[PDB]
Design an enzyme around this catalytic site. Structure first.
Site, PDB file in Angstrom:
ATOM      1  N   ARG C  26      -1.247  16.918  21.786  1.00 44.68           N
ATOM      2  CA  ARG C  26      -0.467  15.987  22.587  1.00 44.68           C
ATOM      3  C   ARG C  26      -0.503  14.572  22.024  1.00 44.68           C
ATOM      4  NH1 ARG C  26      -3.318  17.115  28.081  1.00 44.68           N
ATOM      5  NH2 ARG C  26      -4.992  16.691  26.567  1.00 44.68           N
ATOM      6  N   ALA C  34      -6.869   3.624  10.274  1.00 45.09           N
ATOM      7  CA  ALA C  34      -7.165   2.220  10.407  1.00 45.09           C
ATOM      8  C   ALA C  34      -6.871   1.455   9.152  1.00 45.09           C
ATOM      9  CB  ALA C  34      -8.589   2.020  10.846  1.00 45.09           C
ATOM     10  N   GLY C  37      -4.177  -4.060   8.628  1.00 46.79           N
ATOM     11  CA  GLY C  37      -3.044  -4.344   9.490  1.00 46.79           C
ATOM     12  C   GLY C  37      -1.779  -3.811   8.845  1.00 46.79           C
ATOM     13  N   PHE C  38      -0.835  -3.393   9.687  1.00 49.09           N
ATOM     14  CA  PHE C  38       0.400  -2.843   9.152  1.00 49.09           C
ATOM     15  C   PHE C  38       1.287  -3.951   8.592  1.00 49.09           C
ATOM     16  CE2 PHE C  38       1.224  -3.177  13.810  1.00 49.09           C
ATOM     17  CZ  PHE C  38       2.288  -4.064  13.796  1.00 49.09           C
ATOM     18  N   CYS C  42       9.776  -3.531   8.572  1.00 50.05           N
ATOM     19  CA  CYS C  42      10.257  -2.798   9.741  1.00 50.05           C
ATOM     20  C   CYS C  42       9.446  -3.088  11.003  1.00 50.05           C
ATOM     21  CB  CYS C  42      10.261  -1.290   9.449  1.00 50.05           C
ATOM     22  SG  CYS C  42      10.797  -0.272  10.848  1.00 50.05           S
ATOM     23  N   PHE C  43       8.150  -2.761  10.999  1.00 52.33           N
ATOM     24  CA  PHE C  43       7.400  -2.687  12.255  1.00 52.33           C
ATOM     25  C   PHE C  43       7.353  -4.024  12.996  1.00 52.33           C
ATOM     26  CE2 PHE C  43       4.705   1.327  11.260  1.00 52.33           C
ATOM     27  CZ  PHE C  43       5.860   2.082  11.392  1.00 52.33           C
ATOM     28  N   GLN C  44       6.878  -5.082  12.339  1.00 53.29           N
ATOM     29  CA  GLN C  44       6.759  -6.359  13.041  1.00 53.29           C
ATOM     30  C   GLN C  44       8.120  -6.849  13.517  1.00 53.29           C
ATOM     31  OE1 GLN C  44       3.986  -9.655  11.617  1.00 53.29           O
ATOM     32  NE2 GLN C  44       5.953 -10.748  11.674  1.00 53.29           N
ATOM     33  N   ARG C 112       6.908  -7.061   1.463  1.00 51.14           N
ATOM     34  CA  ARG C 112       7.401  -7.707   2.675  1.00 51.14           C
ATOM     35  C   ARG C 112       6.412  -7.533   3.820  1.00 51.14           C
ATOM     36  NH1 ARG C 112      13.538  -5.429   2.908  1.00 51.14           N
ATOM     37  NH2 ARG C 112      12.421  -3.607   2.082  1.00 51.14           N
TER      38      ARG C 112
HETATM   39  O1  LIG Z   1      -1.918   5.437   9.692  1.00 47.56           O
HETATM   40  C1  LIG Z   1      -1.340   4.423   9.242  1.00 47.56           C
HETATM   41  C2  LIG Z   1      -0.016   4.501   8.825  1.00 47.56           C
HETATM   42  C3  LIG Z   1       0.625   3.374   8.329  1.00 47.56           C
HETATM   43  N1  LIG Z   1      -0.050   2.228   8.250  1.00 47.56           N
HETATM   44  C4  LIG Z   1       0.583   1.006   7.752  1.00 47.56           C
HETATM   45  O2  LIG Z   1       1.791   0.778   8.480  1.00 47.56           O
HETATM   46  C5  LIG Z   1       2.775   0.168   7.647  1.00 47.56           C
HETATM   47  C6  LIG Z   1       4.047   1.011   7.644  1.00 47.56           C
HETATM   48  O3  LIG Z   1       3.896   2.149   6.796  1.00 47.56           O
HETATM   49  P1  LIG Z   1       4.960   3.362   6.886  1.00 47.56           P
HETATM   50  O4  LIG Z   1       4.340   4.579   6.236  1.00 47.56           O
HETATM   51  O5  LIG Z   1       5.456   3.448   8.311  1.00 47.56           O
HETATM   52  O6  LIG Z   1       6.094   2.808   5.876  1.00 47.56           O
HETATM   53  P2  LIG Z   1       7.437   2.015   6.296  1.00 47.56           P
HETATM   54  O7  LIG Z   1       7.098   0.817   7.156  1.00 47.56           O
HETATM   55  O8  LIG Z   1       8.228   1.847   5.029  1.00 47.56           O
HETATM   56  O9  LIG Z   1       8.248   3.043   7.225  1.00 47.56           O
HETATM   57  C7  LIG Z   1       8.408   2.771   8.615  1.00 47.56           C
HETATM   58  O10 LIG Z   1       9.495   1.860   8.793  1.00 47.56           O
HETATM   59  C8  LIG Z   1      10.783   2.394   8.488  1.00 47.56           C
HETATM   60  C9  LIG Z   1      11.046   3.631   9.330  1.00 47.56           C
HETATM   61  O11 LIG Z   1      12.342   4.132   9.011  1.00 47.56           O
HETATM   62  C10 LIG Z   1       9.982   4.662   8.994  1.00 47.56           C
HETATM   63  O12 LIG Z   1      10.215   5.891   9.687  1.00 47.56           O
HETATM   64  C11 LIG Z   1       8.635   4.076   9.381  1.00 47.56           C
HETATM   65  O13 LIG Z   1       7.605   5.028   9.078  1.00 47.56           O
HETATM   66  C12 LIG Z   1       2.149   0.060   6.271  1.00 47.56           C
HETATM   67  O14 LIG Z   1       1.656  -1.279   6.159  1.00 47.56           O
HETATM   68  C13 LIG Z   1       1.015   1.074   6.300  1.00 47.56           C
HETATM   69  O15 LIG Z   1      -0.046   0.756   5.392  1.00 47.56           O
HETATM   70  C14 LIG Z   1      -1.388   2.168   8.689  1.00 47.56           C
HETATM   71  O16 LIG Z   1      -2.003   1.086   8.622  1.00 47.56           O
HETATM   72  N2  LIG Z   1      -1.996   3.260   9.165  1.00 47.56           N
END
Ligand SMILES: O=c1ccn([C@@H]2O[C@H](COP(=O)(O)OP(=O)(O)O[C@H]3OC[C@@H](O)[C@H](O)[C@H]3O)[C@@H](O)[C@H]2O)c(=O)[nH]1
Ligand SMILES: O=c1ccn([C@@H]2O[C@H](COP(=O)(O)OP(=O)(O)O[C@H]3OC[C@@H](O)[C@H](O)[C@H]3O)[C@@H](O)[C@H]2O)c(=O)[nH]1
Ligand SMILES: O=c1ccn([C@@H]2O[C@H](COP(=O)(O)OP(=O)(O)O[C@H]3OC[C@@H](O)[C@H](O)[C@H]3O)[C@@H](O)[C@H]2O)c(=O)[nH]1
Ligand SMILES: O=c1ccn([C@@H]2O[C@H](COP(=O)(O)OP(=O)(O)O[C@H]3OC[C@@H](O)[C@H](O)[C@H]3O)[C@@H](O)[C@H]2O)c(=O)[nH]1
Ligand SMILES: O=c1ccn([C@@H]2O[C@H](COP(=O)(O)OP(=O)(O)O[C@H]3OC[C@@H](O)[C@H](O)[C@H]3O)[C@@H](O)[C@H]2O)c(=O)[nH]1
EC number: 1.1.1.22
Lengths: 463, 463, 229
Positions: C26, C34, C37-38, C42-44, C112
């Site tokens: 689930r 860990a 930081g991401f 995209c994410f931020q 980026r």
């Molecule tokens: O378990 C994890 C997974 C990812 N991350 C980090 O999170 C960030 C994002 O990594 P991703 O593998 O998601 O790579 P991307 O950001 O290119 O892709 C992401 O954004 C675009 C969307 O279309 C993708 O589906 C989404 O996965 C990276 O900095 C990565 O190092 C972690 O810190 N831990």
């Protein structure tokens, strides 16, 4: 048994400390080294780089026999049995703990030279007035050196100094106590015993305290903070006396009769100075914050807040009592060092008071019996500017010349010479009306009044 | 010359002080009066209303000869030469300075009574441990009285009491200082001269300080604050010791070797109590705020903030070390008085600590060698409720009965009896595992560890 | 990442917690790694865009909820750089520190919103001299990225870019791993340890290195989610 002692750092701590060791231990050779080659040359001349009462007699009697000043640091390291480290830990002006925490860069670089040139077992002793984790950084580096070459047996000890500048030779010869910290192990206990044996040449055993490394550093850190707290406490009450018609000198006198409080260090002032107290309390505040002890940090921060408030309100009262204008008025400054019987100006309250008067465009004539002229100008320029010092600051070698034609006198350091001046003649040669502001409570207020001064003193009601 | 002394107020100040006067002045008649006729009867019975070591011998030695306890206030006042006022000045629970300033209502009423029944010239001396403007209110009323009936020639003096409870008889016999303030006039100086004359029967001249009225009160107010600050300073560092693995006992020992600091009043604790320190520091804070000196007020407020924080964090650690639950657990409390060798419970730290454990639904068994049972129950009920005390509080006359079946021991008062207990027997009869928390640093941690306790103490790291 | 701090404070291992958590289908076992930081374009940008959408819909509670994802990420970066400085006795003034990784993740040259940018800036503000190696990021890209958050002059005095990880680590006081490139696993950390200053410290912001092996070599070794004891 130690017979060859070296100290890295020929400053206000290292110089005096080694001089007393050589003076009291005929069979020990003491070599003092420093990165500053010009400073070592002064230690070898007839004009020592610092002024301490009694230091010249001690040094001149031992130098060339069992006391030496060298700039060859590796040669001294290699030949030492025991090595003091007494260098700067300047406060960090950036990053984590900015304006509060000491920067250990010098302590670590010296440790690396010790590891590089020891060539054999050494006892390494960190000796400063504000040690906070300094011995731990030395030990970290040295343990690795031993680890990498077991021929280099190193034991690191903590032995903070307790001398007060101006009385260093008296303090070093008859200390209230000697604090030594080291690791609790066979080799650690042997190293402590050899340092104790050195001091036992002139210090009774019952005044020597041995403990672990951290307790030694924490005790020094706390002891310094207690001393600063006495000053800030009596200084805070000095404002109550001014506001209510009491005399802080009488209040301090009555308070000191309680042997549980003690009568010393109850002398009000424009504010404490020196390279120890402010750095020490801020280091304690920073340590408490990093331990998640906010409550503690706030408590000790008050000692600094009161000190800054005491300096500020003293300078403000000078300006207010001169009808809020000192523009183009000549003001004589009596005292620049942070206390009497020293040329040291580090964190002197005179720097902040003079800066406040400079911002009011006063022309200041400064006299101090021992502070170097170039030292005063560099201190004032670093807080204002080179040009501001050029237009507003005059350095006099004679207090009567500084007071001649002046509108006001400001006493900032308690030099005994300032008591014995001819204040009747001084009053004739000043502008009229003439004012005098006693920031050290050494002058007779009633006598100055009868001479004709508008006279003021910390802890005395201005009327 | 004074030969007939009266004191209005037969409490911890008035009683002992008058006993010492009679004990040292055979030719002086001393009469102690009080509004509480029931309290006067206890002074005249074989069980004195307070416990002070050595007090019983002295009162008994003179009760009936030259020292008396009467309930006839007017006759005692009319016949007196000198009248002490040593009554309550309770803290205001409303209006201006609510919870900070003393209420002078009783001091004022007493002055009025003196004016009504003096019938002739009298010396009136205000004697308390926290004097703040009490002597001025006496003089304001009595100066008016003299004006109206000129026969009554009054002189008001300030004579703070310096005794500490538990050591009162020794302090009164050999004080560090006797502080006397009076008006600067012929009649004022003579009135001081006759009070100085009384004390000189057993106090050396060099320990008697004479000054003006306000200086006397401010000096006492500041001296008490200096004492409280030492305790708060060491208590704040005890948290640093717990967080970094040092021992506060070692730090205090090293600090106290500096004669500029002094070695006394450095014993860490769960927090200071007594009717003086908190009342005094808060009174100083209020004075400052009134003088537009927040800076000063804030500085001294820190002493109170730490004291509250020390009590709070100690009680919190007890609960945390018992896995965050003391619901229905029996906890023995060793000590209730605010210090040893007294039955006085005023502002005792045990009150606040027990209240915290009650709010966690602990069952508390309290033992104190001298505190009256009815006193404890009233103290605890006033901060919680009579119903809460009924469900949770048990008072024992035997420390082993208090500890029998307990999950934990909490030491709150430094009674010597608590050291000499049989902790093997206590450990066997407690729940297992047994925990013990030393808030006074009187017990041997290593010994308690060897018996099998989970043992803790303020200023010792809990691992 | 928030739980990694809880592990550090209580002696647990974030890898073990993540492994145990991920066994619940689930929750799923992916994306529980860990890090410092991401990063990424995209994410931020996405969470901030979601937060702004919620504010404009008068859904502040919702906006506050998702803002926490950004707050933790910034907090994770800041506390990692602070731990580096605190573990080196609060001074890195003029100390050479090697940086392993600059891209925001492995197998790309994209920088980026890389966490490496923010961590390096913090070390620059402490006057550390940083030697950076990344297998794919352009040298000019790093320098422009670092200069845009500090200044070109700061980059000139404090930043040097290496094409070889051993050259970056030679003479360094510490290693900081910021990107999980597979190349960083198989390096010769004994030879690296011999050519570093002693004692040598290493800080793993990606949890790719063997802590026990680094400790036996003689490193002061640290990793996000491992108690430093
Ligand atoms: O378990 C994890 C997974 C990812 N991350 C980090 O999170 C960030 C994002 O990594 P991703 O593998 O998601 O790579 P991307 O950001 O290119 O892709 C992401 O954004 C675009 C969307 O279309 C993708 O589906 C989404 O996965 C990276 O900095 C990565 O190092 C972690 O810190 N831990
Ligand atoms: O690497 C170094 C650094 C410094 N030094 C020397 O060490 C000496 C330091 O002495 P200072 O007079 O400046 O300072 P003190 O000896 O009075 O020390 C005191 O004040 C400064 C604080 O940082 C210390 O903790 C305190 O002991 C200088 O002469 C400096 O030249 C070295 O020889 N090598
Ligand atoms: O009653 C006092 C005492 C001292 N001071 C001031 O406080 C400052 C410090 O005076 P000190 O006599 O302590 O001189 P120092 O600062 O050299 O010594 C201090 O720091 C180093 C420690 O090793 C010493 O034990 C400590 O006394 C001076 O500015 C002095 O003028 C007061 O204003 N009033
Ligand atoms: O109008 C009054 C009020 C009170 N009293 C009596 O005076 C006695 C006061 O004694 P307490 O033990 O309560 O007080 P102490 O003697 O310990 O004084 C100390 O604590 C209380 C503070 O208000 C004082 O400032 C302090 O000196 C009481 O017995 C009370 O009944 C009077 O005789 N007349
Ligand atoms: O080192 C110490 C000293 C004292 N204390 C505590 O501080 C509190 C005050 O105790 P004291 O010994 O000062 O006793 P008292 O409060 O009766 O005397 C105090 O007030 C009246 C004044 O005249 C005295 O001079 C003053 O000492 C007690 O609870 C005591 O346990 C400490 O916790 N540590």
């Amino acid at each position: 048994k130690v017979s060859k002692v070296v100290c890295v750092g020929a400053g206000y701590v290292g110089g005096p400390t080694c001089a007393m060791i050589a003076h009291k231990c005929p069979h020990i050779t003491v070599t003092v080294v420093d990165m500053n080659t010009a400073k070592i040359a002064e230690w070898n001349s007839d004009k020592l780089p610092i002024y301490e009462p009694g230091l010249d007699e001690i040094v001149f009697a031992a130098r060339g026999r069992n006391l030496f000043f060298s700039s060859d640091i590796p040669k001294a390291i290699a030949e030492a049995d025991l090595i003091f480290i007494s260098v700067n830990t300047p406060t960090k002006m950036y990053g984590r703990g900015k304006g509060m925490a000491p920067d250990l860069k010098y302590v670590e670089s010296v440790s690396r030279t010790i590891a590089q040139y020891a060539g054999g077992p050494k006892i390494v002793v960190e000796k400063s007035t504000v040690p906070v984790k300094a011995a731990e950084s030395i030990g970290c580096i040295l343990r690795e050196a031993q680890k990498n070459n077991e021929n280099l047996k190193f034991q690191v000890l903590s032995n903070p100094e307790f001398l007060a500048e101006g009385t260093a030779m008296k303090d070093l010869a008859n200390p209230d106590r000697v604090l030594i910290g080291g690791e609790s192990s066979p080799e650690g206990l042997q190293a402590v015993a050899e340092l104790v044996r050195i001091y036992e040449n002139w210090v009774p055993r019952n005044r020597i305290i041995t403990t672990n490394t951290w307790s030694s550093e924490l005790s020094k850190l706390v002891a310094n903070a207690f001393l600063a707290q006495r000053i800030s406490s009596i200084n805070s009450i000095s404002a109550v006396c001014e506001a209510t018609g009491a005399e802080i000198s009488e209040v301090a006198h009555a308070v000191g009769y309680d042997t549980r409080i003690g009568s010393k260090f109850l002398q009000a002032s424009v504010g404490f100075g020196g390279s120890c107290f402010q750095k020490d309390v801020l280091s304690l505040v920073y340590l408490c914050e990093s331990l998640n002890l906010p409550q503690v940090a706030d408590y000790w921060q008050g000692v600094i807040n009161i000190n800054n408030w005491q300096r500020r309100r003293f300078a403000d009262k000078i300006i207010a009592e001169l009808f809020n204008t000192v523009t183009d008025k000549k003001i004589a400054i009596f005292g620049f060092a942070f206390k009497k019987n020293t040329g040291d100006t580090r964190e002197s309250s005179a720097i902040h008071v003079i800066k406040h008067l400079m911002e009011e465009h006063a022309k200041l004539s400064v006299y101090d019996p021992k502070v170097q002229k170039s030292q005063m100008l560099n201190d004032l320029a670093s807080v204002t500017s080179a040009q501001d010092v050029e237009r507003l600051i005059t350095v006099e070698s004679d207090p009567y010349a500084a007071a001649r034609g002046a509108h006001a006198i400001v006493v900032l350091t308690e030099w005994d010479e300032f008591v014995e001046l001819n204040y009747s003649q001084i009053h004739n040669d000043m502008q009229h009306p003439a004012a005098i502001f006693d920031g050290r409570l050494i002058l007779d207020q009633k006598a100055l009044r009868e001479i004709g001064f508008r006279t003021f003193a910390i802890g005395t009601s201005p009327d």
